[PDB]
C-alpha cells in the first residue's frame, strides 16, 4: 500500500506541476531525466517524487539514491541547462526548501553501500587504480570483486570530477512536501483557479486527471508523454461538455426534443428569400417513394408560393441513381410541378442546373420552382460553385466532399415525413 | 512505467472482480492475504497480480515468489477455507487456468535464492540442525552466515511440512491473465452490463472507479479496505445523479440573468436607425474564427436589411492583428458580403474609414454593409470623431481610449455566439 501511496502522490505533484506551470512550459510525465520534467523556453526542471509518510525523521540516507541520480545526470549533462529538483514528504519536517550542505554531499559519496558506489558513486569517483576500473567494469561482478570495490571506495580518497558547489548553488534545490491530502486539497484548490465548481472538481475533473497522468505514465514512448495545462484544460472541458449534453438529453420524450429543434429552426425558416439545400438519404425515411412529391409540394406551397417576396429556389440532394431521379421526375410531372435535374439522360450539365428561373408576375409564372437531382461528383459540385444559406442533412448523409466553409449546417434527425413537416413549420402538430 | 502500469493493471483486474462478484460477496483490496481477497460465505479467494509484459515466454522462477509466500500462508492458515489464486499476465501465454505440477513446486523449494530461502523455505521446509535454526532465526545475518546457509539448503535434502498435494488439489489456481487493454475492456463491458452508457462509463463510472479502488488501496487499516460491488455502484450512481441535478440546475440562474439582460436590451435593438459598435476580444468567446461570418451575416439579415429603413451602418471593433483582419476580409468577400476595414495593405485610412455607403433603392443596393477593423489608435480616434449611440462591449477589451461622455455603454458577457446572439434578439431560446 506504500508504494500505492508514493505512485498516487507523484501522480498528483505532477497534475500539481502541470496546473501551476503557464500555457508556454511544456510537461514530461515520467520524463528521462525525473518523474516530473518542466521544459520552459531556456530552463529545465526535473522533479523527484519521495514519499515517507512511514518515517518519523528525515535522515540523509533516505535521500542517498536520488541525489545520486541527480549528480550523475548533472555530470553527464553538465552543459545543459537543467534544475534537479528532489521533492520528498516527512511528516515532522517543516514544508519548505531545504539546504544540502557540501559536507553532507561528500558524506553520500562516502555511503558504504555497493550498489551506489558501482552504480553513481564510481562514475562521479572515477578509481585511479585500472584493476578497480576493470571491475567495475564488468557485467557480472562475484562476492570477492564486491567486496574489493568496497574496500577500495571505503580507503581510497578520490576526487570528485562533479562540481559540487556549482550544482548546489544553481542546479540542485531540495523541497520537503507537503502531505499527500495536503497535495491532493491543493491540486483541487488549483482545479478552483481553472473556473470548476467544488463538486465538478470532486466527481469528475479530479479523478479525470488523475486517470489522465496514470494513462500517460504507462506510454513507453517519451515523446507522448509530454502534456501541457492548456491540453489538459481543453480535455476536461471537453469531457466535462459531452457529459453534460447526454444527461440533458436522454430525459425529455422525443416530442420535446422535437418541439426544441422546431424552436431553433422557426427563425431561419421566416425568412422569404433565403436559399435552402435539402440533402436526403431515401432509406432513411419511412414510405419515401410513396411520399416524396407530396412533401415537395407542400414545401413549395409553403415556402415558393408568393412570386414576387419567395425569390430562391429549393435544392434538393437524394443519395439515389440517375434512373430513379427520371422516375421521379416523370411522377412531378404528371403533377405538374416543375423542376429541373441537370441531367440529359445519364450526362449532367452543370448550365442546364445552376441556371435560374425567369419570372413574370402579371402571369404567376416561375420556370421551374425546384432542383432535383442525385449525390453525383458533379453535382457536389454545383453545390460547391453557389453556396446556401441554409444547409439540412436528412439521415447523416456524408457530406464529406462539401465545401461548408461558412454555411449553416442543420442536421435533423427524422424517420419518417410526418417529422420533417413538424420540424420545418408545415405542421402544427405531430 | 512498467511498475506503475502493473499497479493500474492490478486496479483494473480488483475492479473486474467487485463488478463480476455477487452482492454478498465482501472484497478486499490490497488485502491481508493477498492484494485481492474475496471472502464469500465459506470460501474467502486471495488473488495475487503480477504483470510481465516485458517477458517474452513465462519462466517458473518469474513466479516463486508469489508461489512461496502463498504456500506460507496456506502452512500458517491450513485450517482456514482459502483458495488461494495467482493472476499473471504473459504476452506470449494463452489465457485461461495453468496447472502447475508438484515436481514444478518441488523445484521452487530448491531454488538458490538466499531470500526465498531465509523468507519461506526455511518455513516450507525446517533445518534439521540447531545451527542453521540459530542462523536463521538471527535478525541480522552477515556474508558468511548467508552462505553457510544457502549451501546446506543446497545440498541438505529436507521434508516438506505443507501438503503440496492438497494444497495443489484444492487450494491453489494458477491463471493466465489478459492484457492491460483486455483486462481494461473487459472490465468496461462489465460496467455497462450494469445499464451504464459507453460513453458514461468512459467518461465518469471508468476514472472514478480506478480512484476509489487506488483510494482504498491506500488505506492502512485493513476494514477500510473491505469492498464491495453494491457500495460501488451505488456511490457511482450517486455521483452521476449529483452531476446530473448540479448541471441542470445551476443553468437556471445563468438563463434568469440571461433573460433579465435581453429584456434590458431589447428596448433599444427595436428601433431601425440606431448607430450601433461593437467592441470584441476574441479569446473569450470560443469557436470565434468559424463562427464569425455567420453571426455577422445574421446581424445584417435582422438589423441591417430593409434598404429604405435601416440607414446606419454597424461597426464592428476586434481585438487582433491587420492579418488576422485581412484573412477576415476575404473570408467576408468569399461569402458575397461587402465590408469596409480601412486599411489598403497594412496603413489605415480615415476617409476610407469614415465614408458613408451609397444607396440605390431601385436596384436594392448598399455600398458596403459592415465596418470590421482591428483596435488600434487610428481606429479609436475615427470611432471617437463620430460617436454612436449603443457601445456594446463584449470581453471586457480595454476602452481607456474611447470618448464614453454622453455614450450609452452595454457590457456584455458572455462566452460563446448562441449567448450573444439571444442577448440580441436573434435567437428565441438558447
Known sequence: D??????????????????SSTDQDEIQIEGIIEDIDIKNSNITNAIQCKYHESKV?????DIYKPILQMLLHFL????????????????????????????????????????????????IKPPKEQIIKELLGKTSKTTEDKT??????????????????????????FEIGLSYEELMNETKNLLMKEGFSLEDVKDLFYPNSIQYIAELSILPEAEKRISSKNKLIDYLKGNKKTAMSRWTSEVLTRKQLLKVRKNQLVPSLNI?????????????????????????????????????????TPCFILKTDVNNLSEYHKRFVSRNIQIITGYIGDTF???EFNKEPKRIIKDNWVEFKARISCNS???IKCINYKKCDDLYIVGGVDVSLLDTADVNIENLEINNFRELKYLLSMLKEI
Not at 506504500?2 to 505532477?14: D, E, P
Not at 519536517?93 to 557540501?102: A, F, L, N, R, W
Not at 432509406?283 to 415558393?304: A, H
Open 57 to 61: 525523521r528525515h535522515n540523509l540516507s
Open 272 to 312: 422569404n428569400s433565403r436559399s435552402r439545400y435539402f440533402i436526403i438519404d431515401p432509406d432513411t425515411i419511412d414510405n419515401f417513394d410513396d411520399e416524396f412529391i407530396l412533401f415537395v409540394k407542400d414545401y413549395l406551397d409553403k415556402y415558393n408560393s408568393k412570386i414576387k417576396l419567395h425569390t430562391e
Open 377 to 379: 461528383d458533379e453535382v
Open 349 to 351: 450539365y452543370f448550365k
Open 2 to 19: 506504500h508504494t500505492i501511496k508514493g505512485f498516487l502522490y507523484q501522480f498528483n505533484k505532477t497534475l500539481n506541476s502541470i496546473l
Open 76 to 123: 553527464e549533462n553538465d552543459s545543459l541547462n537543467i534544475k534537479y529538483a528532489l521533492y520528498a514528504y516527512f511528516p515532522n519536517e517543516q514544508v519548505g526548501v531545504k539546504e544540502v550542505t557540501k559536507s553532507q554531499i561528500e558524506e553520500i559519496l562516502s555511503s558504504s553501500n555497493f550498489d551506489y558506489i558501482s552504480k553513481y558513486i564510481s562514475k
Open 148 to 173: 574489493r570495490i568496497k574496500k577500495y571506495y571505503e580507503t581510497s580518497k578520490l576526487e570528485t570530477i562533479v562540481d559540487i558547489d556549482k550544482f548546489l548553488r544553481d542546479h540542485f534545490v
